[PDB]
Amino acid sequence: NTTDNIDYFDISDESNYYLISQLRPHFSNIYFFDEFKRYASYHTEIKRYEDIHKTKVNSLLNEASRAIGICNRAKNTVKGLINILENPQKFKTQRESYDVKLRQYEEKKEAFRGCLLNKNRKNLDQIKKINNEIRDLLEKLKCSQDCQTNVYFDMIKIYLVDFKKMPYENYDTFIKQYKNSYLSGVDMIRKIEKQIDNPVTINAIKFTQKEMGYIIDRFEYHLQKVKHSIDQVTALSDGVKPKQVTKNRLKEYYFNIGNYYSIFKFGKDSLNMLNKALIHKEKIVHNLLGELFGHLEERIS
Amino acid sequence: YELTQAPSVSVAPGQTARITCGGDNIGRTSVHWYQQKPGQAPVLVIFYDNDRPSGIPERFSGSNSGNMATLSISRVEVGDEADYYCQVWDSNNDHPVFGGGTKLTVVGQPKAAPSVTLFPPSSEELQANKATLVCLISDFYPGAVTVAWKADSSPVKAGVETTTPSKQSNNKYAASSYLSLTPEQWKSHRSYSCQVTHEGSTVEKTVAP
Amino acid sequence: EVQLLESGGGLVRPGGSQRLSCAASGFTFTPYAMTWVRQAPGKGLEWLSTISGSGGSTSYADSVKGRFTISRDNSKNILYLQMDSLRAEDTALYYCTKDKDEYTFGHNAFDVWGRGTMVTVSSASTKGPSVFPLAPSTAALGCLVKDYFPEPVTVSWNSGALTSGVHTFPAVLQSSGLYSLSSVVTVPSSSLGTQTYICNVNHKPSNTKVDKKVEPKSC
């Protein structure tokens, strides 16, 4: 059919350190800033809640949100070319070759994803400047040589039940089933493809399949990251539990579980979205395979 | 999944070589073929049963059907001598798998007789209470020689180590044989001889102290 | 233009560890699945491990599963293979290779290959060679490179000035576990009294350079 939503594309900086998603808050680091919002909620000697949230965190979210919107024009240009290359009936209403329309898709796609990074470069530098402010805000803790780890382990236990809400095993079952169907569908198109008849339906299948592989590749990335941070903090839930540490150690404690938890929430957003994107692509491939096998009396490939 | 390949295939120049790749219903999956010449990396020569990479000669063709896949090289040249590997995706264990490989040997090349050089033990070596006899065999085709050592006129079995024949730059082969002796053994005898047998003919060299 | 270059293999004790790397260049490295394939001396190709483009999925062969680990750095275009608990049977030439297309997870042909890196797992210690001159009786003179471990050995003549007529034979693997080769050079006997001949033997693993003058035999 038609891909009505191309939210599955992402991009990262050249250092591969910051990952931009089209879903809010576009950066996992924003989820970590919200966790410090909850970390200071339990440390009563910190009343800088309004300063970090209103003056910094929420305005970075809006600037990233605005930067994503600047690329909406390039976003729809890419979708328009996807709907032509995946749809033989639509491709037949236009006049240019399949290789010509295919090259435009490659150019427009790189222009779109590149827009997601270029418009967000100044927002990414703001992330490192905020990271330092949470360390400074945690330095205002009244304690120093002995800092209770009560809140740090209270947050860990709350994180364990938040992980239960996510269906990891079914997500694992899902990606293994569709990846297996994807590979066998790709290998079969290799064998059945020929060049004596009109190759427009084989072309649309291969095009959709290549996007299927990209979605599968991204799904496995997030599923692995989610599993990592889950196993890590449950290990900390079973890992050594001092009733007190020095304020420098408690700072990296909050930064450890805060990073782990923010990757979880970021993965949950992306995995729920990539799940629908892959399902929609698979249904298009099967609609295309029906066209390929719909006129057995005439020809196939 | 397992892929069955014959260890060796022999063809004459200008003929059509055929290298088989066997497997239960291998025709359901794509078969890829790799050529590996000695001391070199594998080169993808046929992919997806019969697709040919740009730059590979048309003499390379492929077929995959039923339980047998076949890579066929037509008008075989001597330069086609290599090891050929097939590969498929193992759909039960979800990973690639390679066949055992097949060595192609192009027959009918001109026969070349080996050249033999024999060096006596070094004088600096004998000062260190050791003695080595060096027998160097060069420029011979085919690559199959047997080496026999002799003290005076008696065969020597102990202390002999011989290399496997290796194809040189010029499609001929080279091998070396080393006889280890004590300095007393070397100065004891009248002579020592390295005899090289190649396709029925012999070349013999001899040194003495 | 598309290049793969393996590195990091050398001598290592049984039970030890060693990290191999593959530097990729000339293409978009991230969307491709990368694969390690080893080849024991004189044996065939053996698939070891494959990793997805993003690293979300990894697979291993039973022969190395639990001991090897594949990984990649998509910001520097480098593929890694961390080998722990190395055994003698891990002695092989380790190849880097790449899927022909993107997002195929190893279910594809391998179009570009590196030239491999030699991993030698053994408990024998690195030993430098002893070099002896093979005096001539056209003539034939040479140098014997005796008892060294491991490979390789490089032999030049007259500090590289002499190059025509030189034949350096493949090394023999002795029952002792040490290697030995001979480098022979054919010169006209016009030169035995005029030109001089010195072999230059270099063994990088033991950091030993030796020169031996090859003079005729005289009484």
Residue numbers in the entry:
A (entry chain A): 170 to 470
B (entry chain C): 7 to 215
C (entry chain B): 6 to 142, 150 to 231
Q: What's in the article?
A:
PvRBP2b interacts with TfR1 through its C-terminal domain (residues 461–633) with a buried surface area of ~1271 Å2, and with Tf through its N-terminal domain (residues 168–460) with a buried surface area of ~386 Å211. Here, we isolate and characterize anti-PvRBP2b human monoclonal antibodies from two individuals in Cambodia with natural P. vivax infection. To further elucidate how human mAbs recognized PvRBP2b, we structurally characterized several antibody Fab fragments in complex with PvRBP2b169–470. We were able to determine eight crystal structures of PvRBP2b169–470 with antibody Fabs with resolutions ranging from 2.45 to 3.45 Å—PvRBP2b-241242 (3.15 Å), PvRBP2b-258259 (3.05 Å), PvRBP2b-273264 (2.55 Å), PvRBP2b-253245 (3.45 Å), PvRBP2b-237235 (2.45 Å), PvRBP2b-243244 (3.35 Å), PvRBP2b-251249 (2.90 Å) and PvRBP2b-283284 (3.15 Å).
241242, 258259, and 273264 form interactions with PvRBP2b169–470 at helices α5 and α6, and 241242 forms additional interactions with part of the N-terminal loop between residues S181–N185. 241242/273264 binds in the N-terminal domain where seven polymorphic residues occur and the crystal structures reveal their binding may be affected by K363 and G382 polymorphisms.
